[PDB]
Symmetry: D3
Subunit: 230 residues, 6 copies
């Protein structure tokens, strides 16, 4: 159907969970989905579709970086008529009050990428998670009674950031953590009148290096339950 997806319209559920690691997407499909069927493996992206509590749901990788997830997200909303994309993954803690293993729900994401400036006439576009998705994630967290931090994330184009002062600047402004996709995903959902959200588990702290399964499984529960609520 597309240069990066061999599936056809209807193969994907209207709600899709995505993570950078394709092997993690495969694990998620085998671990949490019932009757998961591989619907797309172009570039080994591991796109699956099955059901959770009877409802259709797909999971697929999106690679690392805004350019990568921008390709997959745009194709899913445009061609496969997907309605909701929830990003599930790992991130690096920034704020001194955030620690490894904490679960973070992004309200929005800042970025050092030029993509949003390109689509927004060189102005400041606030990559904001869909309010419905943020709410579904927070309610899911409250119902499961799993502690989760809600706030700003930062999508970097440079995992190995040359600008070492940025880290402290983000701590002063209280950005919760860093990942590499949210800022790209959110605006695309807006353009297609669709929805997007993101929830991550802190795998380490960037201002000081600091069981990882429990945290990840708890994050998956929140995302899966929230997907149902949506």
């Amino acid at each position: 159907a597309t240069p990066h997806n061999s599936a056809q319209v209807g193969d994907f559920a209207e709600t899709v969970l995505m993570c950078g690691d394709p092997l993690r997407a495969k694990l998620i499909a085998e671990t949490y989905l019932e009757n998961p069927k591989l619907v797309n493996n172009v570039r080994g992206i591991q796109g699956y579709t099955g059901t959770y509590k009877g409802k259709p749901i797909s999971v697929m990788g999106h690679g690392m970086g805004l350019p990568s997830i921008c390709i997959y997200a745009e194709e899913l909303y445009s061609t496969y008529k997907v309605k909701t994309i929830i990003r599930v993954g790992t991130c690096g803690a920034i704020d001194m009050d955030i620690h490894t293993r904490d679960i973070v729900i992004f309200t929005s994401a800042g970025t050092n990428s030029k993509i949003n400036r390109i689509r927004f006439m060189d102005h400041d576009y606030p990559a904001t998670a869909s309010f419905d998705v943020v709410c579904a994630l927070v309610d899911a967290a409250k119902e499961l009674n799993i502690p989760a931090k809600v706030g700003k994330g930062f999508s970097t184009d440079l995992f190995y950031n040359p600008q070492t002062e940025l880290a402290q600047l983000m701590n002063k402004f209280h950005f919760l953590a860093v990942e590499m996709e949210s800022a790209g995903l959110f605006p695309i959902a807006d353009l297609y009148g669709a929805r997007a959200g993101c929830i991550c588990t802190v795998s380490d702290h960037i201002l000081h290096h600091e069981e990882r399964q429990n945290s990840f499984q708890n994050m998956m529960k929140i995302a899966l339950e929230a997907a149902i609520k949506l």
Copy 2:
């Protein structure tokens, strides 16, 4: 105490409602507050402090534009130890599905200003409303059962915008409305570990010109009730 505020630490409540029009702030103080006392009138800004349902609450103008509200907000959090600032005002509808008189609660705000780039090492800072404030405003709206749209706002530096194509671009990305302060306010609250939010009543539509009291009074109810919840 400051170049723009004659009041002293303690004269302002920890929660302050602000609007551009100083006369509107005076009206609000006389209409909704009990025992409102003028605590600051430097530059005729009309800063008052009284009580709503027994709780301390201040109201004051903030002028028009990011530079203006940036001065007032920073002084309130820094010098007067204010904790929460809720922006109450009017705005211009952008999205074709938004109409005059609708009430909009901003999740975040984009901008064509350079202020956030200056404070964020020339990167994209997502001016995001504090999640607690957004929630308090939405719950207040739900409890009062007053229809309100939640989404992106845009803080322009140019009321009379030379870039006429921006309007349609914002409609495609579904920005709800335009005002001139939010994008400046939100990051300042972050820096001071405090909170900020914004709720506005659409006074007109920019893509086509289209009782205004009811809408405004309903907005005030939401802001006042939300202030109590915070």
Copy 3:
């Protein structure tokens, strides 16, 4: 007539003096004008019209910041057919040779705002005061024999500037003082084929904190006399 002015075409003189503080504009009208009539008080802006030495002259506030004065200036030239706007106000000294209470006449103004880049295809627009106005102000100063410094001003978007190194940079380039409107005003006058100028009294020094009436009254004399010459 406009969203920020209730007056009608003809209520304003062709020459208007403006200052940020609306109460200062009211004081000026009561102190220096004869038969001052309030012609606009939307948002408590205090717009008056009277006569000085028999000639029609209006005074009104313009709020703080480029966005604010940009709204008022554009409406005055476009709708009220105003020809000359002279900004009268206070400013913060930058240059080490400039001291508190000195009077400064701006030849032009730099800025950290993005407004001029937006209107000038992202290039460098030199916000320049109208040569006629600069001359009228300098001649008025020479005739009244009141010492005044002539040179570059800087219109900041951030009263509380995070970039602390900018201050010394401006001292090296000899910017005289800092305010928050000139850079926005000047280009608008150009666009409407009209005129604009600015004169300020230093209220303090930003590189080191350092009767204020005499200085202000002397500045008013220069502006008023220059208004007549124009």
Copy 4:
């Protein structure tokens, strides 16, 4: 060893061929390498090491987009002491004289990404392929007598580019094709005093949609032979 590579120093040859598609990297290892051993499969990246004509050589995926290849390239030069990285892949023709199936050797690559501006004090960094690698690729092409076009490439952050006019602009300046990694790879090699190059096979034309194996196999021959020459 690294967050994206489980291999240890010495597992990778000093020369590594990389392509976006991990499955293509696996195919390449099984098709052109002798005794290929999987040395890294974190995130299913398919990193292999074997020999070509007796010489050690590794092949691995790098995902799509500058951020992705930037992570892998930096780790390979820094941690695994790799000396040469040759990017092998597909691209979209821009120039009207370039057609589908043509083989292109990049001298350099332009980009709409902000990464190089971030590492080069906001100036223009010319992402240039290492002259030794360009020469090795061209000589390999000449020796194998396989027609190949040499010139500028463009690394986009947006596969689906909103700026539709850019395509014709690039045709006027004669950019040969578009991909999504080169501009990021080249500067990293420079920083580590190492080498990088890129060769691609045109899979389609962006200005007009237009056996694909022969072209790909011919490209692999050029890259493999050039790797030996280096």
Copy 5:
């Protein structure tokens, strides 16, 4: 003494007239100066020093473009202790009310160059002509009773400008003419606490192609007389 000047401190007068064409500088020295002595001809720049009405005065070329004049101006103020530099040359009319042969005195100059952003922390630096020099030029013009237009100039980096819409934009904002040095010269004078100005004769109109000696000779009279007044 410098990489571009063989003269020594004292060989240049404190006031120097400069034009792009070195042959024009030689002509000027032979035509208007008494006892002109060649003090610098590195790169055939034709730097001379003589006297006008008994006062020491030097004339020299400065090449075309901001980078070129930036080298010469900085060396003159820094090494040769020059105090005043008056740029004398030709320019292309922009404003519809300006015609070929008109004489223009620049109050300031805009630019599409990045030089001033580099020296001014990426903000808007208003390249402003020294008020003393502007005044001396205007008074000289008034005393000689030679009509001259005073206003904004534009220093382009592109004689052949790809951005064809800029011309009309500058007409709307009333830029008088275009040249290629002023915007670079003015800030340098500021940095050295020295002075600079510019006066040009329109050689053609860019919005429509339209004796040239009289105009040039009249311009020289104004510059020479103004040099004496300074």
Copy 6:
């Protein structure tokens, strides 16, 4: 024919050597060309045309800075139908491994100028030397067996660069040397489907100040021989 060239179509050879110093261009014409005829001296640019080993070849100055060479290069390709321009000149060493008197052949050039961003929709244009010219220069160097370094150059707009940290940054990225024209020349050749290259002799080192004829004569041999090969 043009505002900067009095010659007519056909007066210039299809291959032109250019250097900043017009006197150097005259020397080159008298020293290496047979029957050199002055074909253009507007602004004393010293444009000559003669023959080298029987083949037509022109030499002319281009002033200092991108704006200057941009004027001359564009006119030569557009009006005089020139096909190849080889820049011959001096430069300042950056890389610690490069020393005074070394000969450098630019593969490409970075810049702090805004010119390429203006012509390339504000993106990163890689000012790349034509591969044919780079090859001709390197082969000429190999045949004459004259040691020459091949790599990145940097075209600065500021000979006297305020950003003192840039020098070390360029050393880390291994830019070979600094000049002031290449980045402007290369893109123009691309636009006209023509060719351009650059070769320079290091006259000094910018990170530490460090017979100059031999080096220059060797550079001329390489350029002249390469011109024949093209």
